[PDB]
Amino acid sequence: GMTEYKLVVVGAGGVGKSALTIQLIQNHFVDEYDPTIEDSYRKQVVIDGETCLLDILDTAGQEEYSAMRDQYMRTGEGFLCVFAINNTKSFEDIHHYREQIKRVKDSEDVPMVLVGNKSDLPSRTVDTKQAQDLARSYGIPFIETSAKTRQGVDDAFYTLVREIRKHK
Numbered sequence: 714g715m716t717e718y719k720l721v722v723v724g725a726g727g728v729g730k731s732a733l734t735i736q737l738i739q740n741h742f743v744d745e746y747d748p749t750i751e752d753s754y755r756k757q758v759v760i761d762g763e764t765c766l767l768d769i770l771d772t773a774g775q776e777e778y779s780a781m782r783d784q785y786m787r788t789g790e791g792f793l794c795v796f797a798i799n800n801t802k803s804f805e806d807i808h809h810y811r812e813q814i815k816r817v818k819d820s821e822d823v824p825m826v827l828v829g830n831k832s833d834l835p836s837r838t839v840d841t842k843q844a845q846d847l848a849r850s851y852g853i854p855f856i857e858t859s860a861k862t863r864q865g866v867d868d869a870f871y872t873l874v875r876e877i878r879k880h881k
């Protein structure tokens with residue numbers, strides 16, 4: 714049968730979670746997507762010759778640490794932790810999202826990729842070396858993306874699928 718991979722995109726509001734998700738789903742850059750919409754989107758893709766079914770949860774909204782929301786995020790098999798390279802605060806938030814993933818999955822070994830988005834912009838405030846070194850601290854891959862130009866989009870999602878395959 715065709716394997717389905719539940720991927721969850723997390724990170725601060727405005728970093729480009731929706732734009733990255735829609736680039737993968739539509740193959741089109743959407744510069745405007747209702748920032749409150751949290752939804753899931755499926756796509757059949759060939760990763761390493763294998764046709765598999767991606768189920769991408771594009772998260773949104775305020776913090777909620779209820780049993781219900783925990784249960785919901787627990788369905789995720791792998792996570793993209795997204796920050797924007799021109800927003801220091803979104804990068805400084807990453808450790809929170811990682812800590813909540815570790816908590817709800819009850820594991821130090823959850824498939825995860827650090828994503829530096831908006832790589833097309835000249836307004837960088839987060840050094841690539843700082844981002845690579847944070848991924849190194851966590852033992853996870855780091856991928857530089859632009860939802861605008863599609864730079865790195867497949868790399869980010871496909872790497873996460875590969876991390877899930879390993880973890881199994």
Ligand SMILES: C[C@H]1CN(C)CCN1c1cccc(-c2noc([C@@]3(C)CCCc4sc(N)c(C#N)c43)n2)n1
Binds near residue numbers: 779782786810
């Ligand atoms: C960085 C912090 C703290 N900061 C002081 C204010 C802004 N902020 C925000 C603001 C909005 C959201 C979040 C947030 N945190 O985790 C989560 C996610 C979705 C990640 C995946 C695992 C779990 S499990 C659970 N119940 C979650 C929930 N909700 C989460 N979303 N965090």
Ligand SMILES: Nc1nc2c(ncn2[C@@H]2O[C@H](COP(=O)(O)OP(=O)(O)O)[C@@H](O)[C@H]2O)c(=O)[nH]1
Binds near residue numbers: 726733832834
């Ligand atoms: N230049 C540029 N703008 C982006 C990129 N990704 C998202 N944006 C913009 O960043 C803002 C927030 O994007 P959005 O997808 O809503 O972020 P979300 O809140 O994380 O879902 C919008 O103004 C988008 O047009 C990117 O890679 N490059």
Ligand SMILES: [Mg+2]
Binds near residue numbers: 730732746747750771
């Ligand atoms: Mg969004």
